[PDB]
Write a protein that holds these residues in place. Structure first.
Motif, PDB file in Angstrom:
ATOM      1  N   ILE A  70     -20.030 -16.947  86.369  1.00  0.00           N
ATOM      2  CA  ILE A  70     -18.689 -17.110  86.938  1.00  0.00           C
ATOM      3  C   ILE A  70     -17.756 -16.210  86.139  1.00  0.00           C
ATOM      4  CG2 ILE A  70     -16.992 -18.795  87.810  1.00  0.00           C
ATOM      5  CD1 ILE A  70     -18.867 -21.046  87.391  1.00  0.00           C
ATOM      6  N   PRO A  71     -17.855 -14.886  86.270  1.00  0.00           N
ATOM      7  CA  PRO A  71     -17.068 -14.007  85.379  1.00  0.00           C
ATOM      8  C   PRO A  71     -15.569 -14.175  85.535  1.00  0.00           C
ATOM      9  CG  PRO A  71     -18.132 -12.751  87.147  1.00  0.00           C
ATOM     10  CD  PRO A  71     -18.751 -14.128  87.158  1.00  0.00           C
ATOM     11  N   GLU A  72     -15.095 -14.490  86.736  1.00  0.00           N
ATOM     12  CA  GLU A  72     -13.671 -14.706  86.967  1.00  0.00           C
ATOM     13  C   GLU A  72     -13.288 -16.188  86.911  1.00  0.00           C
ATOM     14  OE1 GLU A  72     -11.033 -12.214  87.526  1.00  0.00           O
ATOM     15  OE2 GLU A  72     -12.584 -11.295  86.307  1.00  0.00           O
ATOM     16  N   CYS A  73     -14.044 -16.993  86.159  1.00  0.00           N
ATOM     17  CA  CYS A  73     -13.619 -18.349  85.830  1.00  0.00           C
ATOM     18  C   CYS A  73     -12.201 -18.335  85.255  1.00  0.00           C
ATOM     19  CB  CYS A  73     -14.602 -18.950  84.817  1.00  0.00           C
ATOM     20  SG  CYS A  73     -14.194 -20.641  84.298  1.00  0.00           S
ATOM     21  N   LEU A  74     -11.349 -19.263  85.703  1.00  0.00           N
ATOM     22  CA  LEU A  74      -9.994 -19.300  85.152  1.00  0.00           C
ATOM     23  C   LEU A  74     -10.080 -19.646  83.668  1.00  0.00           C
ATOM     24  CD1 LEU A  74      -8.183 -21.220  88.065  1.00  0.00           C
ATOM     25  CD2 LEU A  74      -8.061 -18.749  87.558  1.00  0.00           C
ATOM     26  N   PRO A  75      -9.424 -18.883  82.783  1.00  0.00           N
ATOM     27  CA  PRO A  75      -9.590 -19.127  81.336  1.00  0.00           C
ATOM     28  C   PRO A  75      -9.349 -20.568  80.916  1.00  0.00           C
ATOM     29  CG  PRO A  75      -8.405 -17.058  81.716  1.00  0.00           C
ATOM     30  CD  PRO A  75      -8.513 -17.759  83.063  1.00  0.00           C
ATOM     31  N   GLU A  76      -8.324 -21.225  81.458  1.00  0.00           N
ATOM     32  CA  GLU A  76      -7.985 -22.574  81.024  1.00  0.00           C
ATOM     33  C   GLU A  76      -8.923 -23.624  81.605  1.00  0.00           C
ATOM     34  OE1 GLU A  76      -6.277 -20.769  83.144  1.00  0.00           O
ATOM     35  OE2 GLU A  76      -5.919 -21.995  84.905  1.00  0.00           O
ATOM     36  N   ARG A  77      -9.866 -23.219  82.459  1.00  0.00           N
ATOM     37  CA  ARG A  77     -10.904 -24.104  82.955  1.00  0.00           C
ATOM     38  C   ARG A  77     -12.267 -23.842  82.326  1.00  0.00           C
ATOM     39  NH1 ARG A  77      -9.148 -25.521  89.262  1.00  0.00           N
ATOM     40  NH2 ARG A  77      -6.898 -25.451  88.785  1.00  0.00           N
ATOM     41  N   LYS A 113     -15.391 -39.368  81.213  1.00  0.00           N
ATOM     42  CA  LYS A 113     -14.510 -38.538  80.397  1.00  0.00           C
ATOM     43  C   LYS A 113     -14.354 -37.150  81.011  1.00  0.00           C
ATOM     44  CE  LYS A 113     -14.085 -36.320  75.998  1.00  0.00           C
ATOM     45  NZ  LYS A 113     -15.036 -35.245  75.579  1.00  0.00           N
ATOM     46  N   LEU A 114     -15.450 -36.587  81.522  1.00  0.00           N
ATOM     47  CA  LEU A 114     -15.375 -35.282  82.169  1.00  0.00           C
ATOM     48  C   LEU A 114     -14.558 -35.357  83.449  1.00  0.00           C
ATOM     49  CD1 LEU A 114     -16.169 -32.297  82.579  1.00  0.00           C
ATOM     50  CD2 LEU A 114     -18.357 -33.108  83.539  1.00  0.00           C
ATOM     51  N   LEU A 115     -14.785 -36.397  84.253  1.00  0.00           N
ATOM     52  CA  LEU A 115     -14.030 -36.566  85.484  1.00  0.00           C
ATOM     53  C   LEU A 115     -12.534 -36.657  85.208  1.00  0.00           C
ATOM     54  CD1 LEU A 115     -13.835 -37.038  88.429  1.00  0.00           C
ATOM     55  CD2 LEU A 115     -14.470 -39.453  88.086  1.00  0.00           C
ATOM     56  N   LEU A 116     -12.155 -37.394  84.165  1.00  0.00           N
ATOM     57  CA  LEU A 116     -10.739 -37.480  83.802  1.00  0.00           C
ATOM     58  C   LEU A 116     -10.177 -36.115  83.424  1.00  0.00           C
ATOM     59  CD1 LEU A 116     -10.772 -40.748  81.780  1.00  0.00           C
ATOM     60  CD2 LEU A 116      -9.385 -40.298  83.819  1.00  0.00           C
ATOM     61  N   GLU A 117     -10.937 -35.331  82.663  1.00  0.00           N
ATOM     62  CA  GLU A 117     -10.447 -34.003  82.297  1.00  0.00           C
ATOM     63  C   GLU A 117     -10.296 -33.118  83.531  1.00  0.00           C
ATOM     64  OE1 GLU A 117      -9.055 -32.844  79.095  1.00  0.00           O
ATOM     65  OE2 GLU A 117      -8.502 -31.657  80.845  1.00  0.00           O
ATOM     66  N   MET A 118     -11.277 -33.155  84.439  1.00  0.00           N
ATOM     67  CA  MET A 118     -11.192 -32.344  85.651  1.00  0.00           C
ATOM     68  C   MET A 118     -10.010 -32.766  86.512  1.00  0.00           C
ATOM     69  SD  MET A 118     -15.258 -32.016  86.501  1.00  0.00           S
ATOM     70  CE  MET A 118     -15.080 -31.023  88.004  1.00  0.00           C
ATOM     71  N   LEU A 119      -9.831 -34.086  86.705  1.00  0.00           N
ATOM     72  CA  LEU A 119      -8.705 -34.577  87.492  1.00  0.00           C
ATOM     73  C   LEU A 119      -7.373 -34.152  86.890  1.00  0.00           C
ATOM     74  CD1 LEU A 119     -10.100 -38.204  88.219  1.00  0.00           C
ATOM     75  CD2 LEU A 119      -9.587 -36.456  90.000  1.00  0.00           C
ATOM     76  N   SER A 120      -7.284 -34.078  85.558  1.00  0.00           N
ATOM     77  CA  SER A 120      -6.037 -33.662  84.932  1.00  0.00           C
ATOM     78  C   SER A 120      -5.753 -32.186  85.179  1.00  0.00           C
ATOM     79  CB  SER A 120      -6.069 -33.968  83.424  1.00  0.00           C
ATOM     80  OG  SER A 120      -6.841 -33.031  82.676  1.00  0.00           O
ATOM     81  N   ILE A 121      -6.779 -31.399  85.481  1.00  0.00           N
ATOM     82  CA  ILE A 121      -6.592 -29.974  85.737  1.00  0.00           C
ATOM     83  C   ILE A 121      -6.297 -29.701  87.207  1.00  0.00           C
ATOM     84  CG2 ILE A 121      -7.885 -27.772  85.821  1.00  0.00           C
ATOM     85  CD1 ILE A 121      -9.208 -28.716  83.173  1.00  0.00           C
ATOM     86  N   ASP A 122      -6.995 -30.381  88.124  1.00  0.00           N
ATOM     87  CA  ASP A 122      -6.935 -30.034  89.545  1.00  0.00           C
ATOM     88  C   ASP A 122      -7.458 -31.232  90.336  1.00  0.00           C
ATOM     89  OD1 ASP A 122      -7.112 -28.950  92.118  1.00  0.00           O
ATOM     90  OD2 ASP A 122      -7.670 -26.972  91.357  1.00  0.00           O
ATOM     91  N   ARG A 123      -6.544 -32.043  90.864  1.00  0.00           N
ATOM     92  CA  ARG A 123      -6.967 -33.270  91.532  1.00  0.00           C
ATOM     93  C   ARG A 123      -7.768 -32.975  92.786  1.00  0.00           C
ATOM     94  NH1 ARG A 123      -2.191 -37.788  90.998  1.00  0.00           N
ATOM     95  NH2 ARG A 123      -1.920 -37.500  88.736  1.00  0.00           N
ATOM     96  N   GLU A 124      -7.222 -32.144  93.677  1.00  0.00           N
ATOM     97  CA  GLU A 124      -7.868 -31.951  94.968  1.00  0.00           C
ATOM     98  C   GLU A 124      -9.196 -31.230  94.824  1.00  0.00           C
ATOM     99  OE1 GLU A 124      -8.163 -30.017  99.003  1.00  0.00           O
ATOM    100  OE2 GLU A 124      -6.061 -29.767  98.407  1.00  0.00           O
ATOM    101  N   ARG A 125      -9.265 -30.203  93.981  1.00  0.00           N
ATOM    102  CA  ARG A 125     -10.552 -29.524  93.860  1.00  0.00           C
ATOM    103  C   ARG A 125     -11.570 -30.366  93.100  1.00  0.00           C
ATOM    104  NH1 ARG A 125      -6.624 -25.395  93.430  1.00  0.00           N
ATOM    105  NH2 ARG A 125      -6.527 -24.143  95.337  1.00  0.00           N
TER     106      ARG A 125
END
Ligand code: NI
Length: 287
Positions: A70-77, A113-125
């Protein structure tokens, strides 16, 4: 793609190996964040699930699986995306090994814990991704769990992509050729270590071809390489035509272009990743 987070890497061996149809190798700049996510996944796994011994997941000597694929992964993700990918490596090995109460409870704490981190970044995705992730959490024609679904979920989250519902059936069907090429190459490079691990105790395309045609390993490898080249060439042609017509949404074209770098990136990573190096074999691997 308008590249913002990656650089192209010269690796002449890919031209000689001829498994990637000349697709360039690209690697996300944030390798340090990928390796941080991997280390935190290992720390959490040892805290919640069990001991690691001789375990290697996505880390490589120069870059990791996610940075190349995923070379164009968003840096903060990146840290979260790498954590999740490493979690999947750990979970898949434990599921293979198995196929106790506090380890399964620990694994759900780690998922939450991972789900919480993901939800804090992008709920819909995150909701798209975890619906894709739900299941996970004789001949080469029958040989083929929906690992595409894990990667679909991870890439769309990693790059903040939303595939329009009316394009999803087509996009997923065309992506299958990239998953087959990368998956066959993966089996090609993992077979030796897998055979070593089994002989000291194999659902692999090399094994399937050997049985189907009554041939040696290296003869099956050649057959497998021919199939890889067919699948990768078809995918490259399809993506090129879709990008020239420019009718699909930008996000669907971004996902399919990322499939190109998944082919080149996984192939480059396979070459020296410790996960598939015989040199890193241990007895009693955990998980
Ligand atoms: Ni075409």
């Amino acid at each position: 793609m308008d590249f913002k987070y990656s650089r192209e890497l010269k690796l002449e061996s890919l031209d000689a190996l001829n498994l990637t149809e000349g697709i360039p190798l690209r690697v996300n700049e944030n390798i340090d964040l990928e390796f941080r996510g991997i280390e935190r996944a290992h720390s959490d796994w040892e805290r919640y699930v069990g001991k690691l011994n001789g375990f290697h997941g996505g880390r490589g000597p120069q870059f990791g699986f996610v940075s190349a694929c995923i070379p164009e992964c968003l840096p903060e993700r990146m840290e979260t995306v790498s954590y999740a990918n490493e979690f999947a490596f750990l979970h898949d090995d434990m599921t293979d090994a198995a196929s106790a109460r506090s380890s399964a409870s620990g694994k759900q704490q780690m998922q939450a814990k991972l789900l919480l981190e993901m939800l804090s970044i992008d709920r819909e995705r995150t909701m798209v991704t975890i619906k894709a992730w739900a299941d996970f959490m004789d001949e080469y024609i029958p040989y083929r769990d929906c690992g595409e679904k894990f990667w679909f979920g991870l890439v769309t989250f990693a790059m903040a992509l939303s595939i329009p519902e009316q394009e999803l059936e087509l996009v997923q069907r065309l992506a299958q050729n990239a998953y087959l090429a990368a998956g066959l190459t993966n089996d090609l490079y993992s077979y030796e270590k897998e055979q070593l691990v089994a002989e000291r105790s194999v659902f692999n395309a090399i094994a399937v071809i050997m049985q189907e045609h009554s041939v040696s390993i290296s003869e099956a490898e050649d057959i497998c390489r021919g199939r890889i080249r067919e699948y990768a060439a078809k995918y490259v042609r399809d993506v090129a035509d879709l990008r020239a017509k420019n009718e699909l949404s930008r996000d669907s074209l971004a996902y399919l272009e990322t499939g190109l770098y998944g082919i080149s990136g996984s192939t480059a990573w396979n070459l020296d990743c410790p996960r598939y190096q015989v040199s890193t074999f241990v007895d009693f691997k955990t998980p």
